[PDB]
Amino acid sequence: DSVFGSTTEVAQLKKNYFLPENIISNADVTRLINSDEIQSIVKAAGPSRVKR
Amino acid sequence: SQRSKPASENVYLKLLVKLYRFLARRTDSRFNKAILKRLFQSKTNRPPISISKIAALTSRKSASSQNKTTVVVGTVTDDERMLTVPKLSIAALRFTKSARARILKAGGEVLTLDQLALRAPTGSNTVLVRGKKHA
Amino acid sequence: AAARPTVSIYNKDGSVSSETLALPFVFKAPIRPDLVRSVHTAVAKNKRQPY
Amino acid sequence: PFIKKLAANDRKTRDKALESLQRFLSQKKKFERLDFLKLWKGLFYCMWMADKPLYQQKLSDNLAALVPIVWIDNRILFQSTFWETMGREWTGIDILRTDKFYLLMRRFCAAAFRDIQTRSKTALLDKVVAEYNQMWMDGPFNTENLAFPNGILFHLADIWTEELRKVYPEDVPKADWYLPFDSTIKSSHNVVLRKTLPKRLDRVSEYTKDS
Amino acid sequence: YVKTWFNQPGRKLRRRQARQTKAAKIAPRPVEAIRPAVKPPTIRYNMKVRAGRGFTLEELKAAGVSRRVASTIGIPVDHRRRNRSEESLQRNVERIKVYLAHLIVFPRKAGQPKKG
Amino acid sequence: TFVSSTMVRAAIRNQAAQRYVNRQESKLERQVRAQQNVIPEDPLDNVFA
RNA sequence: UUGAGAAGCUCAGACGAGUAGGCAGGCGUGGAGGUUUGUGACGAAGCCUUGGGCGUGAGCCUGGGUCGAACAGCCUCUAGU
RNA sequence: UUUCAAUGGCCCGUCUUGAAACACGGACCAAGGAGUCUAGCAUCUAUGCGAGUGUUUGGGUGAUGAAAACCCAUCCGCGAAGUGGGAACGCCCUUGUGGCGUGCACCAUC
Numbered sequence A: 001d002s003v004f005g006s007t008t009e010v011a012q013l014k015k016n017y018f019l020p021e022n023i024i025s026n027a028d029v030t031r032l033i034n035s036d037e038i039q040s041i042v043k044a045a046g047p048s049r050v051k052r
Numbered sequence B: 001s002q003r004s005k006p007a008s009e010n011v012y013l014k015l016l017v018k019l020y021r022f023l024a025r026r027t028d029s030r031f032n033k034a035i036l037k038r039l040f041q042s043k044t045n046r047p048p049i050s051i052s053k054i055a056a057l058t059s060r061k062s063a064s065s066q067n068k069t070t071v072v073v074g075t076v077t078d079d080e081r082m083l084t085v086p087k088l089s090i091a092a093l094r095f096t097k098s099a100r101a102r103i104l105k106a107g108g109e110v111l112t113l114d115q116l117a118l119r120a121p122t123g124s125n126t127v128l129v130r131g132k133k134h135a
Numbered sequence C: 001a002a003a004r005p006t007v008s009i010y011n012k013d014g015s016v017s018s019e020t021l022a023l024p025f026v027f028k029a030p031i032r033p034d035l036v037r038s039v040h041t042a043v044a045k046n047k048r049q050p051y
Numbered sequence D: 001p002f003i004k005k006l007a008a009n010d011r012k013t014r015d016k017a018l019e020s021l022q023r024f025l026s027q028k029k030k031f032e033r034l035d036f037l038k039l040w041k042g043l044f045y046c047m048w049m050a051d052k053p054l055y056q057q058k059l060s061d062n063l064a065a066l067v068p069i070v071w072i073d074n075r076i077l078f079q080s081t082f083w084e085t086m087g088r089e090w091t092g093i094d095i096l097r098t099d100k101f102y103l104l105m106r107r108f109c110a111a112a113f114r115d116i117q118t119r120s121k122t123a124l125l126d127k128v129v130a131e132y133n134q135m136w137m138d139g140p141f142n143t144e145n146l147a148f149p150n151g152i153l154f155h156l157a158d159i160w161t162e163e164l165r166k167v168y169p170e171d172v173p174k175a176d177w178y179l180p181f182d183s184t185i186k187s188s189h190n191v192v193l194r195k196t197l198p199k200r201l202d203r204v205s206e207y208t209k210d211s
Numbered sequence E: 001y002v003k004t005w006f007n008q009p010g011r012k013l014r015r016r017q018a019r020q021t022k023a024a025k026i027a028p029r030p031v032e033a034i035r036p037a038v039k040p041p042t043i044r045y046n047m048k049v050r051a052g053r054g055f056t057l058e059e060l061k062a063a064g065v066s067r068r069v070a071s072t073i074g075i076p077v078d079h080r081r082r083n084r085s086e087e088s089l090q091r092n093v094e095r096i097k098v099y100l101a102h103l104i105v106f107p108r109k110a111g112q113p114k115k116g
Numbered sequence F: 001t002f003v004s005s006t007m008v009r010a011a012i013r014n015q016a017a018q019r020y021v022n023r024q025e026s027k028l029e030r031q032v033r034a035q036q037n038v039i040p041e042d043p044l045d046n047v048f049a
Numbered sequence G: 001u002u003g004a005g006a007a008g009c010u011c012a013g014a015c016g017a018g019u020a021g022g023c024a025g026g027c028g029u030g031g032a033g034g035u036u037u038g039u040g041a042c043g044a045a046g047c048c049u050u051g052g053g054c055g056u057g058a059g060c061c062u063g064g065g066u067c068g069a070a071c072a073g074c075c076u077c078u079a080g081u
Numbered sequence H: 001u002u003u004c005a006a007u008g009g010c011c012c013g014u015c016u017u018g019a020a021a022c023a024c025g026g027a028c029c030a031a032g033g034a035g036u037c038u039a040g041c042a043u044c045u046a047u048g049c050g051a052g053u054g055u056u057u058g059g060g061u062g063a064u065g066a067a068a069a070c071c072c073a074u075c076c077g078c079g080a081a082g083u084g085g086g087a088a089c090g091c092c093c094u095u096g097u098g099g100c101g102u103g104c105a106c107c108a109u110c
Helices: A029-033 B011-026 B030-039 B051-058 B097-106 B113-119 C033-045 D011-024 D033-048 D053-069 D073-086 D099-118 D125-139 D152-168 D181-184 D191-200 E009-025 E057-063 E067-073 E086-101 F005-017 F019-036
Strands: B067-076 B091-096 B108-112 B126-128 C006-010 C014-020
Touching: A029 B113, B011 B030, B011 B113, B011 D152, B030 B126, B030 D073, B051 B067, B051 B097, B067 C033, B091 B097, B091 B113, B097 D099, B108 B113, B108 D053, B108 E009, B113 D033, C006 F005, D011 D033, D033 D053, D033 D073, D033 D099, D053 D073, D053 D099, D073 D099, D073 D125, D073 D152, D099 D125, D125 D152, D125 D181, D152 D181, D152 D191, E057 E067, E057 E086, F005 F019
Parallel strands: B067 B091, B067 B126, B091 B108
Antiparallel strands: C006 C014
């Protein structure tokens, strides 16, 4: 914790160093896509690989 | 570098493109289509927008910003020249360390583009903004 | 964003102890194979003798 | 009742800490909100670490049955803090742990109705629901808290009537059962939430007075 | 001709070994002599304070150290520098006085004839 | 009539003469801002620590 | 219906000369980091062959013979390729 | 694989030239054999941070190679110095249609 610090608190052993932040908070894209918040407003999915 | 996939090798940027690929085709929103297009754009085409521009644009003319989230596919830098920061809710790819601290301590919140997709999957009540490309 | 809170400390005989340590925030940092292998490529060149 | 023991890496320690915490919650003292918020950080991770479906069905039952054990004065704070920690950590869960936490929220949804019925034996039902409707309105159904996920509220709407009927199998008395949803649908700044909650909710106006 | 810096880490090691070599010979006294505090001679830098070459004779006289004693206890003397203001004099007189407080001077054996 | 080269070098030198203090004040003011822009403790962070 | 290397899978239509030049993806060589809990005196590498196979191709795999001590696939790095 | 039959098939590269004609180079095989390194500049992309940014002149340090990695004192360089159309969004309500607002980037008008 002193070598690397935290994403909000500076590292003790590295002057003015903070841990990098992420472009996504939660990196489980399946959890976002298959969530109740998102799946409740998507239109009815067409079929998978369609018949010829 | 801008057409069908980002030129970026960032794994987490690919996870956002994957999330908004689903949102663009499974919803009839132009916000999800616009956000997806701006994820393919390069760093030159995604200029930073200052914390002062967000405050100015929301409380502009009639103001009445209410609580609409400000969305930018880019970095929200800080403007140390402005001294009082309003209560803002911004969703961006990246915030600088000073901008994130100023937004949080001065009222509101900072979000990522995946935290906003769960709050406004269709991008309703969002203020989509851009940075000036004049540079 | 949710990870295991603590980790167990093991003794010399491989037995668990009652003590635990909160997981440091470095294990919650982004994992960037593109960035790691770009920095490694440069650092691996920094002990090369000239020919 | 140590929180660090509640989130231990071995299930035997977590079960022992859960049993010790059963007495700690029944003291005749007022716990502040922060004390319960820290307590619910360990309890969330006690549930977060449950492994098999049969254990996490019983574990969620144990946590729900903990509510009547708490002192009546700070029992509302116990539920209000549960829904605060289930809103700030909901989006951080992964897709393989949502089903185990859906059941916990469902068990606590019915734990509120069951506590309403218990207090209705002595006190009048109108004020008991009013105390709970204040908890719902100040917490999950707050309109000024934009960051509270809709997944929790969509789940609550789906199970509100079905878990109220479980508590009152014979008949459901008149009360403001669906007050939090009425306040949310009317005056929420989430257009996705208010356009979809009436579809998810199945409120029965059979008993509530016509407006 | 192209100068290359492959001996850059070998010069770093060689210079550090000289400091260790010097410290071995002079075991408890500092590896450097105390330097004065001066101000750089331009309108761009006169606000900064940096280290000088040696202390002036007027600074040593006020501190109580003679110019012959000074060199023997690690205090350099700059016969060229002068004190055009009282702040430079007092800034470096205090610097000498603090140095004398923290200094232990080991006694020397003295030749002493029988009589006379 | 216009100026003389005696002061022209003095004017340009006086222009860059303030470069040191401007950099020192800019660095000094930045650290004051970082001291003010400290995110609070979030007391739910020492719960397991 | 299992067909989510979502960098995958799938449906449909049109189209196909090409110098200079523009662009993309691949084949091969020496050495380096990692890996294959890799191959080898029960035979590595190399070479030979009207043996067999794979790829539109660069090339690759393999049988037999010869041979005698080392060598390769994959991700990345590098160049006297 | 060899060989036969039927049909077809002008010697390759270079230069020339509409084109060829040409004139050149070529007895055969093996091995070697030609856009490299570096300094500066500009565009573009990626990466880090962002009104900042750049550790490696140097110092500290590094016991398992210590020319690596790790750390940063003082400087310094480069930067800082109203009306229309319109992306996107909400609300409707004859509901689609359109209208009412809010209007980024950028372009026109003061």
